[PDB]
mmCIF file of C-alpha atoms and ligand atoms in Angstrom:
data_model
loop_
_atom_site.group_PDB
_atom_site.id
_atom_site.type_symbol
_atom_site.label_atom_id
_atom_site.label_comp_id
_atom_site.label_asym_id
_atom_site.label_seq_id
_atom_site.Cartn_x
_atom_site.Cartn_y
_atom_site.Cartn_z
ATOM 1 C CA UNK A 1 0.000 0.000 0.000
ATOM 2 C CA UNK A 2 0.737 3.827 -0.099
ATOM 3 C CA UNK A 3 2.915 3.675 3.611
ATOM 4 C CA UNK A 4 5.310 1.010 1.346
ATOM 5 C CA UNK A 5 7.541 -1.248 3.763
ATOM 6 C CA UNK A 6 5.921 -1.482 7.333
ATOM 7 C CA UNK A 7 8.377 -1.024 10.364
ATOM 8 C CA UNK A 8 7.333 -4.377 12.231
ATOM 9 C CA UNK A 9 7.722 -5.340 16.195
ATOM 10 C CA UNK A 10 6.233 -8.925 17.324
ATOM 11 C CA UNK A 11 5.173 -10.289 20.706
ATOM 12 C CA UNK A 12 5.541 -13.862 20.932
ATOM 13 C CA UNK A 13 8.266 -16.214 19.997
ATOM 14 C CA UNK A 14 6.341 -18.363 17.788
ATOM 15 C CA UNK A 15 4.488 -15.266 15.948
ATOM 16 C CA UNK A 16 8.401 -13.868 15.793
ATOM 17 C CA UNK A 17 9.639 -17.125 14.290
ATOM 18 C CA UNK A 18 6.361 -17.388 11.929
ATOM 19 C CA UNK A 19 7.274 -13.958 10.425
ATOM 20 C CA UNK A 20 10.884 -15.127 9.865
ATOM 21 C CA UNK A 21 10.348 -18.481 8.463
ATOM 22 C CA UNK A 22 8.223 -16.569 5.929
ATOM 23 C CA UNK A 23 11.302 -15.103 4.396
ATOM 24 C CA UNK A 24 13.854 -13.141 6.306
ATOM 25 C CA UNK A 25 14.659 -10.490 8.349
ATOM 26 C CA UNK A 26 13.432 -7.503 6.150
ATOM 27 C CA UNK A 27 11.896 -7.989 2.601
ATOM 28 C CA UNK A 28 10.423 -5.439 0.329
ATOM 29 C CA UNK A 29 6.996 -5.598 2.073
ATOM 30 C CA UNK A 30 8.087 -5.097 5.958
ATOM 31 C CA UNK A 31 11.285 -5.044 8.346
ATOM 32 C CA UNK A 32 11.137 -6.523 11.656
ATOM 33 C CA UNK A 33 12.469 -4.193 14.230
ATOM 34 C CA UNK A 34 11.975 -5.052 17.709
ATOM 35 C CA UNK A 35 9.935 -7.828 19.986
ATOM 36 C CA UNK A 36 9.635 -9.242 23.329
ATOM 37 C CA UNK A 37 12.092 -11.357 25.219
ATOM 38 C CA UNK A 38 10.762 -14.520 24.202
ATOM 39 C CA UNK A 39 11.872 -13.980 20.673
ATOM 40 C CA UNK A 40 14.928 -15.649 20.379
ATOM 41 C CA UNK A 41 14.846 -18.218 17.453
ATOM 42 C CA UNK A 42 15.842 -17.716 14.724
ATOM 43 C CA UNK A 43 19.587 -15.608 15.061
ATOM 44 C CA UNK A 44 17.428 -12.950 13.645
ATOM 45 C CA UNK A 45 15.218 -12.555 15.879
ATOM 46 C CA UNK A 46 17.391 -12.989 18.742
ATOM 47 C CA UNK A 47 18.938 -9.660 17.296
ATOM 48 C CA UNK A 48 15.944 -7.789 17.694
ATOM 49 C CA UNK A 49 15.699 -4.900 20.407
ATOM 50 C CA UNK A 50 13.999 -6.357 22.838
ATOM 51 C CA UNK A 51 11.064 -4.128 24.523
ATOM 52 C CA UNK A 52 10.201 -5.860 27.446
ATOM 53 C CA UNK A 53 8.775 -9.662 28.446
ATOM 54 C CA UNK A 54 5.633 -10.680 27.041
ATOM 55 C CA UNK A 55 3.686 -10.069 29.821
ATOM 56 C CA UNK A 56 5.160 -6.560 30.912
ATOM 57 C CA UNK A 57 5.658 -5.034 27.567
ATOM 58 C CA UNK A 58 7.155 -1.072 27.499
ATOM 59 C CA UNK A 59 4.692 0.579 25.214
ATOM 60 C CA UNK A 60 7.114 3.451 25.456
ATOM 61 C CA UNK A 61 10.304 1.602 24.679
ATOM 62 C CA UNK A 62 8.169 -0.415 21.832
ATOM 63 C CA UNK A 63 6.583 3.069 20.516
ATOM 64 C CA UNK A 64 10.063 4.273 20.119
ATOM 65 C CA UNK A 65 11.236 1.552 17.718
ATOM 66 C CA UNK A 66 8.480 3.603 15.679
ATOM 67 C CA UNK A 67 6.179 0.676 14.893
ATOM 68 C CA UNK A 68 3.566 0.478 11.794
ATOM 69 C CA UNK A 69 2.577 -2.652 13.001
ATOM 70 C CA UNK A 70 2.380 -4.930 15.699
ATOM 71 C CA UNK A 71 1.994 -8.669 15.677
ATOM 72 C CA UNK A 72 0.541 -10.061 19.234
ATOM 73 C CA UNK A 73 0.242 -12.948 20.368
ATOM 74 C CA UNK A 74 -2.705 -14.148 23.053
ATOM 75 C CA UNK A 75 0.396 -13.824 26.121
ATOM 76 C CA UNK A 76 0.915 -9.628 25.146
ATOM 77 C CA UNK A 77 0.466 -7.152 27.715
ATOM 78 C CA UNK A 78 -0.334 -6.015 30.321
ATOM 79 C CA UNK A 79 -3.615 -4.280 28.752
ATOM 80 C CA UNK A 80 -2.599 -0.757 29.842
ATOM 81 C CA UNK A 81 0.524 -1.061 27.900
ATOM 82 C CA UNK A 82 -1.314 -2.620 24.949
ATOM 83 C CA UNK A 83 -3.699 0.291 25.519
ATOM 84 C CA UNK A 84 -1.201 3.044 25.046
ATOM 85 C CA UNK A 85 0.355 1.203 21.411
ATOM 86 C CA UNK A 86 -3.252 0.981 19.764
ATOM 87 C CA UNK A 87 -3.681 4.847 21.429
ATOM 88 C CA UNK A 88 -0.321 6.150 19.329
ATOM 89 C CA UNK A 89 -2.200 4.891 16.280
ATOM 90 C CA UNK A 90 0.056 1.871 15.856
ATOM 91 C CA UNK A 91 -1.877 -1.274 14.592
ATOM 92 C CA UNK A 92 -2.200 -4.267 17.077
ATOM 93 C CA UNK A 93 -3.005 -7.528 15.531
ATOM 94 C CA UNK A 94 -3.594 -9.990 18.019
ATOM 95 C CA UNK A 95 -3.218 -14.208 17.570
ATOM 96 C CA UNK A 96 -5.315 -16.525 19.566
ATOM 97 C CA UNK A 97 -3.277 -19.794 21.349
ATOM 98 C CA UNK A 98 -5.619 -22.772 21.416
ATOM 99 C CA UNK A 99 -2.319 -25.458 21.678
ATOM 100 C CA UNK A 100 -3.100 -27.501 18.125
ATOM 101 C CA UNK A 101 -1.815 -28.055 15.143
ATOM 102 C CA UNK A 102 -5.105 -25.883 13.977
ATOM 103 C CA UNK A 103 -4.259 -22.517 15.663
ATOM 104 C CA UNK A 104 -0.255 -22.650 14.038
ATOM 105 C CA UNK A 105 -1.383 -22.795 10.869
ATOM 106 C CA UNK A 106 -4.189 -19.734 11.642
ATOM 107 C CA UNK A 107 -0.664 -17.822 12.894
ATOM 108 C CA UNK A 108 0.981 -19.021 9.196
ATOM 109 C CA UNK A 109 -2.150 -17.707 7.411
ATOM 110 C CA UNK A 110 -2.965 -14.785 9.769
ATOM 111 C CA UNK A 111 0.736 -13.346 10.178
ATOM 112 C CA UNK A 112 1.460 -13.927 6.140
ATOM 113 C CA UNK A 113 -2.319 -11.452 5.511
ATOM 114 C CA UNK A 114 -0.876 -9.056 8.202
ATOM 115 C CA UNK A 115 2.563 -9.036 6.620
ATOM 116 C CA UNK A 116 0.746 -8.980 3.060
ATOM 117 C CA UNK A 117 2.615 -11.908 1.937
ATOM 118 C CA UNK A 118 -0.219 -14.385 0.963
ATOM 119 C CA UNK A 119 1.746 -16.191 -1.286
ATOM 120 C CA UNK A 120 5.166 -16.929 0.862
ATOM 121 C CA UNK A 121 2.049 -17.989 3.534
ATOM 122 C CA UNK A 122 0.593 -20.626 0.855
ATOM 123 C CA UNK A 123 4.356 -22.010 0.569
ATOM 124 C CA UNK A 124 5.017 -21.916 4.246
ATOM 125 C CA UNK A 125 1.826 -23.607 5.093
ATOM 126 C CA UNK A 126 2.348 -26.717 2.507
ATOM 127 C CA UNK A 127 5.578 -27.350 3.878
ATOM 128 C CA UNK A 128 4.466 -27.105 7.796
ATOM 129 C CA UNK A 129 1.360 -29.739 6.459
ATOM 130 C CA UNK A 130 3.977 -31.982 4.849
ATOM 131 C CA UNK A 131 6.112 -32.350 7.635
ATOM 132 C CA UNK A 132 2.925 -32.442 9.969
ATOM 133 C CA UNK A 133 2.039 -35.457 8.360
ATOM 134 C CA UNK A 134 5.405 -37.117 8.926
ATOM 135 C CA UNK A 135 5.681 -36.627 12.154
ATOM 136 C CA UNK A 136 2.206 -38.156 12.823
ATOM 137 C CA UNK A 137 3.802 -40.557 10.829
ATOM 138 C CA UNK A 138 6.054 -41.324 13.389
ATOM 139 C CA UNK A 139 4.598 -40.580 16.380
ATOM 140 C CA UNK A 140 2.236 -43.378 15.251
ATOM 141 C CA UNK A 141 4.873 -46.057 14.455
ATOM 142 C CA UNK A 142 5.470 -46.571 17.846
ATOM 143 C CA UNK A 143 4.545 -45.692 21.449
ATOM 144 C CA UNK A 144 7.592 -44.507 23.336
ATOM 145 C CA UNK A 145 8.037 -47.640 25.599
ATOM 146 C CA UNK A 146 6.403 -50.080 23.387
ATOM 147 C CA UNK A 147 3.068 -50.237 25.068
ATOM 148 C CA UNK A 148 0.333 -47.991 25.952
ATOM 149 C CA UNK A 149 0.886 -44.101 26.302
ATOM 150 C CA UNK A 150 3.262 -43.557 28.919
ATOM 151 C CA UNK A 151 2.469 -40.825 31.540
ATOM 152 C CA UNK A 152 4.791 -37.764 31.489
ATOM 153 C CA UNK A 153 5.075 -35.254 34.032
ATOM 154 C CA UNK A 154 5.946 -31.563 32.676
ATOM 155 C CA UNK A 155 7.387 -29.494 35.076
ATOM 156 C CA UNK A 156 7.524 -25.525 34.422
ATOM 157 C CA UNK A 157 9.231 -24.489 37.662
ATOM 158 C CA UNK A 158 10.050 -24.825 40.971
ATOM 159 C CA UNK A 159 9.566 -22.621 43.974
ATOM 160 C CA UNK A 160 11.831 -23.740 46.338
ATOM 161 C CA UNK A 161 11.147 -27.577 47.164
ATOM 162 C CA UNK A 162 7.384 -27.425 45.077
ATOM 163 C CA UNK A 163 7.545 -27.538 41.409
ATOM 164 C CA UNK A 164 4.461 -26.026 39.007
ATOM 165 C CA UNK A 165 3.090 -28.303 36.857
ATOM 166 C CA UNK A 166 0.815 -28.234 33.461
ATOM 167 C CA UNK A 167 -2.468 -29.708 34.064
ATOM 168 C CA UNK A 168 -5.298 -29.209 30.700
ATOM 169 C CA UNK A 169 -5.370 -26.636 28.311
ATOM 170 C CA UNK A 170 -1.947 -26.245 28.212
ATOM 171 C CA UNK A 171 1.044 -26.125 25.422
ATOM 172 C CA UNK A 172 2.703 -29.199 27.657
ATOM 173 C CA UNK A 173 -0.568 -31.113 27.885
ATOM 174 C CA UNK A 174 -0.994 -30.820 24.011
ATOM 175 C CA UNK A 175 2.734 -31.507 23.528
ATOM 176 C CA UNK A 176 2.650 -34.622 25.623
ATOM 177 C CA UNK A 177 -0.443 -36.303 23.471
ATOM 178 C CA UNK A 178 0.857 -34.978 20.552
ATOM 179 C CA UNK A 179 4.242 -37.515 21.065
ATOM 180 C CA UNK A 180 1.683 -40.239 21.933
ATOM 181 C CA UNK A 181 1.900 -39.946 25.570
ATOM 182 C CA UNK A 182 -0.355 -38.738 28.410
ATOM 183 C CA UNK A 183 -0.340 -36.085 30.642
ATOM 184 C CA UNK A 184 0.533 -37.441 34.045
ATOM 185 C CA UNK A 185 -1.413 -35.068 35.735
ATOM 186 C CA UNK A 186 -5.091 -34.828 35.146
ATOM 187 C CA UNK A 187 -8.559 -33.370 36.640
ATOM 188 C CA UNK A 188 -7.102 -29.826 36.786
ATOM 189 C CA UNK A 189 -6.477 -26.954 34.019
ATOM 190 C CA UNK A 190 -3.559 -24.701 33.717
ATOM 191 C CA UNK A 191 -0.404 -24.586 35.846
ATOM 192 C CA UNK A 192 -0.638 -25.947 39.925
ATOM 193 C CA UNK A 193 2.143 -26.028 42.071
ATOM 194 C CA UNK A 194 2.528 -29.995 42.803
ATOM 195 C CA UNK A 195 2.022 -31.716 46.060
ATOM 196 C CA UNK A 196 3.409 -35.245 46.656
ATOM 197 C CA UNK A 197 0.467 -36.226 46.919
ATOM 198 C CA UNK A 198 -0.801 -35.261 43.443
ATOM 199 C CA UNK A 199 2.403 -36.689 42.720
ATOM 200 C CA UNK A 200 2.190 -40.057 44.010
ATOM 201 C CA UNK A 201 -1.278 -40.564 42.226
ATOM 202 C CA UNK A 202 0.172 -38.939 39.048
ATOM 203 C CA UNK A 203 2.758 -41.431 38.840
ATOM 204 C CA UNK A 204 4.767 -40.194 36.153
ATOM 205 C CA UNK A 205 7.271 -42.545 33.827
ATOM 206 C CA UNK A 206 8.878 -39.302 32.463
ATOM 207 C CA UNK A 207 9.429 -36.283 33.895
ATOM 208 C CA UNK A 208 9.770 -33.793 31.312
ATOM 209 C CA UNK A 209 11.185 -30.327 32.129
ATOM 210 C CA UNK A 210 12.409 -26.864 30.245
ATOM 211 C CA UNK A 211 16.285 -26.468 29.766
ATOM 212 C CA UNK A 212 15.299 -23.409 31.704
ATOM 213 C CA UNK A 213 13.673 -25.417 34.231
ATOM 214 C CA UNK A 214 16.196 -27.901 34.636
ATOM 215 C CA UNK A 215 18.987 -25.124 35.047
ATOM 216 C CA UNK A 216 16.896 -23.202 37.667
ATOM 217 C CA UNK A 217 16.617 -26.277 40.100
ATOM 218 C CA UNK A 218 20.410 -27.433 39.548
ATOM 219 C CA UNK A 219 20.547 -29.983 37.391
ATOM 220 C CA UNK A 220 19.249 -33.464 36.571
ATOM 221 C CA UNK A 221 20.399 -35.070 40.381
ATOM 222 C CA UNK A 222 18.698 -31.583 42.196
ATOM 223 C CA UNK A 223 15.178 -32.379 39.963
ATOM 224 C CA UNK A 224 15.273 -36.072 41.216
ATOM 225 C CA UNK A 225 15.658 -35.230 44.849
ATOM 226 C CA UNK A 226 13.063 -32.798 44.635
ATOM 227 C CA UNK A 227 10.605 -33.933 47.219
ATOM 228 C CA UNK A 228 8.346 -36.858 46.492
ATOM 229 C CA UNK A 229 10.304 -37.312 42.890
ATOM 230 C CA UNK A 230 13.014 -40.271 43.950
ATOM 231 C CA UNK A 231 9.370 -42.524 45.115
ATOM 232 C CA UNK A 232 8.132 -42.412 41.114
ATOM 233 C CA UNK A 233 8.540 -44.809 38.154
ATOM 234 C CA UNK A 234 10.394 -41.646 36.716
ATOM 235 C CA UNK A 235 12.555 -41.325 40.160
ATOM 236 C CA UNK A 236 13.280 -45.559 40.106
ATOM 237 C CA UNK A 237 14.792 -45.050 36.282
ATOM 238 C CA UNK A 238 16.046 -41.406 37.031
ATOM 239 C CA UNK A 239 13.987 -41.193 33.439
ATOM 240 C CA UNK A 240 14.135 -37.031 33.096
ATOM 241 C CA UNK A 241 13.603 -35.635 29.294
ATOM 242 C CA UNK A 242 14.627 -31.825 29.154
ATOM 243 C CA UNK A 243 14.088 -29.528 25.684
ATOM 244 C CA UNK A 244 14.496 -26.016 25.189
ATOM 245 C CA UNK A 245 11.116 -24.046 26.276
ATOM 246 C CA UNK A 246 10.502 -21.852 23.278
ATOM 247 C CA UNK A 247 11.085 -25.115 20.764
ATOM 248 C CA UNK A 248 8.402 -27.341 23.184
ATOM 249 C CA UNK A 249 6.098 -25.245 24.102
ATOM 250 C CA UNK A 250 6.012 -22.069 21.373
ATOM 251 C CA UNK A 251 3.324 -23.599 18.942
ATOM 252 C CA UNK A 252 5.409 -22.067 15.927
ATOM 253 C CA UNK A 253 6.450 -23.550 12.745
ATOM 254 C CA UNK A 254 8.444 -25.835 14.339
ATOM 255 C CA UNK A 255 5.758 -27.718 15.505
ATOM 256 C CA UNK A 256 6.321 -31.214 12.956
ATOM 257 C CA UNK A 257 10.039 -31.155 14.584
ATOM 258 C CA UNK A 258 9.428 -30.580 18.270
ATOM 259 C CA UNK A 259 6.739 -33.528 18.383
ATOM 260 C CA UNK A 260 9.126 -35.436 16.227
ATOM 261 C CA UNK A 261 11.863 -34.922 18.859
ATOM 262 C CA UNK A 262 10.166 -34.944 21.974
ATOM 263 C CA UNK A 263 8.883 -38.017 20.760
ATOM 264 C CA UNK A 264 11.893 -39.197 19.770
ATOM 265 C CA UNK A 265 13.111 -38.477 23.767
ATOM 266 C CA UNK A 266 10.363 -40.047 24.898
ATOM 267 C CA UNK A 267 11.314 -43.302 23.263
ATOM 268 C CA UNK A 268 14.791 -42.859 23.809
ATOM 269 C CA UNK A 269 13.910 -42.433 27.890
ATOM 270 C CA UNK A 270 11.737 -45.602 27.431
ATOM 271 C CA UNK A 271 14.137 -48.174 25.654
HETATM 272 CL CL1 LIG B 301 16.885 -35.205 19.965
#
């Protein structure tokens, strides 16, 4: 259109990555100048000035990176700060997060229309289906462990001796089926901080944990002494699986590759 090649900033690691894998870091249609913290894959965006985490944005510091446009995803805010952007007369367009295969292709489609690069979406989007289908492929050529689903425990966090774990509706929950596993925990949505006793009944054959995670509680023989952890079919076989956060649990592009290779962990974990 008549404002020719958009200054771009984008909240969200997996929108961030979407825009890149469409093709590059500035093309004649738009130039991607700034994002949250959570954008760090590819190089690119890891270059990007960063203007805050996802969930305590600057508007200021992102309004100063002179924005035409603004890719958010569900995670951006706080609203205030949101508020102030769409006030400046900067465009906000904002992603929903549903945790399916479904709602990355919508950010494929949605972010190539905002970027007005239907066509490098079309291409994007057959290759992401392609590989989709491959790695249900082979995800369904075997169960990790050779049996039924195993049950995997995903922890976020830990707060001192408790760690947070997914429950439902979550990008681990969706993760874990996705491999052909189960979510350990169940009867709960969201994030809950985990009591041995939830943990005993949960039962896990896998705990499954963040790079992140696993370097904020010390390591793979800190996460097994963890309270309640060492009295688990996971504790018994010191079975831990750890993956970088924004490759599990983004919902990008990379989707057909992280199921591929947490599955691939999985089975590994379970020989
Ligand atoms: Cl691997």
């Amino acid at each position: 259109g008549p404002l020719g090649s958009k200054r771009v900033i984008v909240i969200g690691g997996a929108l961030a990555e979407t825009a890149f894998a469409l093709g590059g870091a500035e093309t004649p249609r738009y130039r991607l100048v700034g994002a949250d913290t959570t954008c760090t894959y590819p190089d690119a965006a890891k270059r990007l000035p960063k203007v805050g985490y996802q969930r305590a944005l600057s508007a200021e510091g992102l309004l100063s990176l002179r924005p035409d446009l603004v890719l958010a995803s569900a995670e951006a805010g706080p609203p205030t700060a949101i508020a102030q952007v769409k006030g400046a007369g900067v465009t906000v367009t904002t992603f929903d997060e549903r945790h399916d295969v479904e709602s990355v292709r919508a950010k494929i489609t949605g972010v190539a229309q905002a970027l007005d690069v239907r066509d490098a979406g079309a291409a994007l989007l057959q290759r992401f289906d392609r590989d989709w289908q491959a790695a249900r492929d082979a995800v369904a050529a075997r169960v990790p462990g050779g049996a039924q689903p195993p049950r995997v425990l995903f922890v976020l966090n830990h707060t001192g001796t408790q760690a947070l774990v997914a429950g439902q509706r979550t990008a681990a929950d969706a993760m874990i089926r996705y491999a052909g596993a189960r979510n350990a925990m169940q009867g709960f949505d969201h994030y809950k901080p985990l009591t041995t006793e939830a943990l005993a009944a949960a039962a896990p054959d896998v705990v499954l944990i963040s790079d992140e995670g696993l370097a904020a509680v010390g390591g793979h023989a800190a996460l097994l002494a963890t309270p309640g952890f060492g009295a688990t079919p996971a504790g018994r076989a010191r079975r831990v699986v750890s993956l970088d956060a924004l490759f599990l649990l983004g919902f990008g592009p990379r989707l057909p590759l992280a199921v591929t290779t947490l599955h691939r962990r999985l089975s590994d974990a379970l020989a």
